[PDB]
Design a protein around this ligand. Structure first.
Ligand SMILES: [Mg+2]
Ligand SMILES: [Mg+2]
Ligand SMILES: [Mg+2]
Ligand SMILES: [Mg+2]
Ligand SMILES: [Mg+2]
Ligand SMILES: [Mg+2]
Ligand SMILES: [Mg+2]
Ligand SMILES: [Zn+2]
Lengths: 86, 50, 112, 136, 175, 44
RNA sequence: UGGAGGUAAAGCUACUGAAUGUAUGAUGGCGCCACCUAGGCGUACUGAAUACAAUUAAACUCUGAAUGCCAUUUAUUUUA
RNA sequence: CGGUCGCCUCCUAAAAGGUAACGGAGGCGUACAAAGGUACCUUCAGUACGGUUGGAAAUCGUAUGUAGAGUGUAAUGGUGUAAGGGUGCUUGACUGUGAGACAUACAGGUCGAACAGGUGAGAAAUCAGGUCAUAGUGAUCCGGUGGUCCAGUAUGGAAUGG
RNA sequence: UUUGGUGCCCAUGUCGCUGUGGAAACACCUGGUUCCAUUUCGAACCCAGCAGUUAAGCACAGUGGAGCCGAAUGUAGCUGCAGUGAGAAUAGGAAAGCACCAAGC
RNA sequence: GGUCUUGUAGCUCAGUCGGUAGAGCAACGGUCUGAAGAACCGUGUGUCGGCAGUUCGAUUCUGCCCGAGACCACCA
């Protein structure tokens, strides 16, 4: 004997934007390529790297990429591009 | 939807170059801006155009 | 709340953060510092964390109005063939003694 | 009946109970406690039954301490219904018990009285209990 | 002016009174602030204009109108609707106002028997509750629609209250 | 840039003294009834 | 070899909720007087906040792996 | 039958990304001539004490207070010298572009160095191609309007199109 | 080496408590007449001056009171039953450190 | 068993998406009257079903619970 059901009311969700880490350490990158995609500055910009309107990190010059910690209790993070020894 | 948009127009060449947004209900004063007008090739005072 | 000098230190921290964040080039900064007695200046070069040249009212001068600290440091910088700097108001305001110093520096070939 | 007064969410997920007794591992207040030897979900009704049993067989001489508490809720789809179409309503609270947690403990009364009271209480709980004395 | 007598006698006599051996370890009075708290202007009692007028007349220091730092649902005050009034005065105006008050206004009060029993905050500061505006000579019979008082403060250059008592007593303040 | 207050003088009615530092000088050399050194707290 | 990460776990005076015992207990329930309007005594009890000891959590985190992932070097192999 | 049909936030999602259910929880179809750009100046909420109106809680003053405050807005992340608060000037809430990347079946979506023109703030450095970030959206087809260094069925026009 | 200034770091860099000193400097400090400034005001900013100052800031010594840091051992999780290695607690550490410039040394 | 609707003064019914509770009679007082009705004058009462949120003060805007009311439910 079937009965009455319904009113789930909770069947919605949004598309998952692929924020994360697009470039790990030791990678060759050319200016314009984006290192880190995030929402809010979970990773601060170091030297020779830029911060877009969407808070997308992107390099300003060609070289290796380095991550590094800082902050009150070693919790904050900078990502920076180190030049070649040219 | 709500038709909150509006168009800006030059007062020398009378083109409708720009488009912007404006809430008529709160500020009814017609916009008086001065942006770069391509045809005039300088900065020209723009007024709202219906 | 502060001691009339802690605010100056905080302001200088603000401004040095600004230059260290905005200076794409390696232009040597020109940090002027203001004391109630007199004034002194050093040329700090970043990306190296050293001082290239410095000057002060302690070059046998009295209290300050004595813009010679502009000309002498300009001489040192032009000898080091830099002659293009970003100015820094320390924690003070660009006015009075600081303005006179900056004009003296600019008039003798500095690029700012 | 032990029960949280109010909560944030009404339909939480089930909480596993197969571990080695994170927290509540050792006796802390009395000289004799009850320790489980097989983790299982024990609801508030069994808790109240054990509590009233210990209270009735204790007397006006000592104290009894309860350690666990039914924080987690639990759902039960009503009778005679196909599955799907949402999640069932909450019916009964339940205290998660991992194997090796002191949960009941009494004091200030003869030793054989702790033994008999804890054995009386242990037969109401599904878990296989075990008597434990407080360390020195 | 009061400063005349102040660094004529009071500074050095307090210096010798307490074991300081430092001329300016003596307390110095830093500032007085003025407040009246015009709450009857929920939206319009008088637009506060008249009260601003007497607070301007009492001292050339231009009164400043304060903004509501929060919002209260009990009243018709919600994040703004500027209320109150503050006047901070220092320098020679400070001493002028101090003598004018202590030698004209409080003796003109209904019964100025005494004060200063416990009104210290506990960190070398004191506040006087003024009952009415008409108490002061720098005001006419005509005034705001209602008769409001003032809230003044006396902040010292120190925190322990012993020399606060010493300084206030030494300038002939009623206790 | 404000009301031009000046060194307005006072006139004590009982203490036979005067005060003149700065005040609203529209009525310079004004009279005061309750003298400064007349209140019971001040004197008495 | 370097790095990102916040899961397993663990902890809750490290925050948000829930919550155990003890100590001081704001508050209130009760009775109580005297007060017609301010308060006092204990408060079978409800119990703020603090302290000590013990807890719980997919949508709690002061913390926190291994595996996995990304990149790179060496060595080997295949023309994918 | 009932409920749902697109987009955004978290959890399920097993520490890169991705991952379904008529799974658990919420919002959106915006707002702002300033809540933008810029120079300068400034930094919490609560609590304690003091102070007439005025009270538990208005304003004010002094300490304490690592954030429990704020950020137009649901959720998350971030943010105590900021991205929070105020002041002066202002429209870069520009034109023409765009190497290079992100995600991708396609259509579409996002970030963006750098160049030229001409501006605004600032002494200058520098900054400004909307807002702390993520939702605030609709393909063609058809027709309507403005401009038009285009065509005009033999030619000059015009209708009509691009 | 001392002092002053600044930069990089980020509490083992804090918040306190008791003392010591200012030669040069550093600060208070003296006034608003000038540039400039206050939703108001020489408070702050900015001027031009050093009469006094060890008071405070500042620096140097001691202080483990709070906060921060935290071994080794064992244990929880893993990952093919050995390695793997936490968290919590604990001994304990801890009164910042690194550099350049300027005067006296 | 589900999806909606409603709960307001003593009663029966109204209340700009936010700053707001309104009628008639019921109850009280006086007048008329031998007294009672009827009638005339004044009156009086209101915290919006109970618990939770957004809120610039939520009866008003949303959620849960309680109560009742409605068109409907074993294959068809
Ligand atoms: Mg776990
Ligand atoms: Mg904004
Ligand atoms: Mg902005
Ligand atoms: Mg926005
Ligand atoms: Mg033809
Ligand atoms: Mg033709
Ligand atoms: Mg055409
Ligand atoms: Zn034009």
């Amino acid at each position: 004997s079937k009965k009455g059901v319904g009113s789930t009311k909770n069947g919605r969700d949004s598309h998952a934007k692929r924020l994360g880490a697009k470039k790990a350490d030791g990678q060759m990158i050319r200016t314009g390529q984006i290192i880190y995609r995030q929402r809010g500055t979970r990773v601060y910009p170091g030297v020779n790297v830029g911060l877009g309107s969407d808070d997308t990190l992107f390099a300003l010059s060609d070289g290796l990429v380095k991550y590094q910690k800082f902050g009150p209790k070693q919790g904050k993070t900078r990502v920076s591009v180190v030049k070649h020894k040219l | 939807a709500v038709k909150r948009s509006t168009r800006l127009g030059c007062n020398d060449c009378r083109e409708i170059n720009y488009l912007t947004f404006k809430n008529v209900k709160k500020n009814p004063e017609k916009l008086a801006l001065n942006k770069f007008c391509s045809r005039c090739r300088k900065v020209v005072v723009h007024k709202e155009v219906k | 709340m502060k001691t009339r000098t802690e605010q100056r230190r905080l302001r200088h921290k603000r401004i040095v953060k600004k230059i260290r964040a905005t200076n794409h080039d390696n232009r040597v900064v020109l940090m002027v510092i203001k004391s109630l007695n007199h004034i002194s200046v050093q040329a700090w070069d970043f990306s190296q964390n050293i001082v290239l040249a410095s000057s002060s009212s302690l070059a046998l001068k009295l209290k300050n109005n004595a813009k010679l600290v502009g000309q002498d440091i300009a001489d040192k910088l032009v000898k080091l063939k830099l002659t293009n700097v970003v100015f820094d108001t320390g924690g003070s305001k660009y006015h009075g003694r600081i303005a006179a110093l900056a004009e003296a520096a600019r008039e003798r070939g500095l690029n700012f | 009946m032990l029960q949280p007064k109010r909560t944030k969410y009404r339909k939480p997920h089930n909480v596993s109970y197969e571990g080695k007794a994170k927290g509540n591992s050792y006796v802390a207040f009395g000289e004799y406690g009850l320790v489980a030897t097989k983790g299982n979900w024990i609801d508030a009704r069994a808790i109240e039954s054990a509590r009233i049993a210990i209270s009735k067989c204790l007397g006006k001489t000592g104290k009894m301490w309860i350690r666990i508490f039914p924080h987690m809720s639990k759902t039960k789809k009503p009778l005679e219904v196909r599955m799907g179409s949402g999640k069932g309503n909450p019916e009964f609270w339940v205290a998660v018990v991992k194997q090796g947690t002191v949960m009941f403990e009494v004091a200030n009364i003869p030793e054989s009285q702790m033994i008999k009271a804890l054995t009386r209480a242990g037969h109401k709980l599904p878990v296989t209990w075990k008597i434990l004395k407080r360390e020195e | 002016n009061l400063k005349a007598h102040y660094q004529k006698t009071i500074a050095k006599e307090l210096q010798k009174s307490f074991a300081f051996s430092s001329i300016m370890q003596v307390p110095r009075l830093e500032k007085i602030v003025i407040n009246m708290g015009v709450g009857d202007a929920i939206r319009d009692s008088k637009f506060l204009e008249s009260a601003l007028n007497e607070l301007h007349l009492i001292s050339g220091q231009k009164p400043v109108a304060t903004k509501a730092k929060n919002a209260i649902s009990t009243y018709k005050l919600r994040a703004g609707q500027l209320i109150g009034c503050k006047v901070t005065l220092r320098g020679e105006r400070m001493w002028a106002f101090l003598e004018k008050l202590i030698y004209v206004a409080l003796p003109r009060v209904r019964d100025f028997r005494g004060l200063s029993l416990k009104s210290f905050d506990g960190r070398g500061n004191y506040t006087i509750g003024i009952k009415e505006q008409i108490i002061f000579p720098e005001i006419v019979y005509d005034d705001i629609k209602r008769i409001r008082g003032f809230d003044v403060t006396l902040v010292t250059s120190t925190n322990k209250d012993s020399e606060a008592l010493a300084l206030l007593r030494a300038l002939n303040l009623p206790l | 840039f404000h009301f031009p207050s000046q060194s307005v003088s006072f006139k004590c009615a009982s203490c036979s003294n005067s005060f003149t530092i700065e005040s609203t000088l529209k009525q310079k050399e004004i009279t005061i009834d309750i003298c400064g050194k007349c209140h019971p707290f001040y004197i008495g």
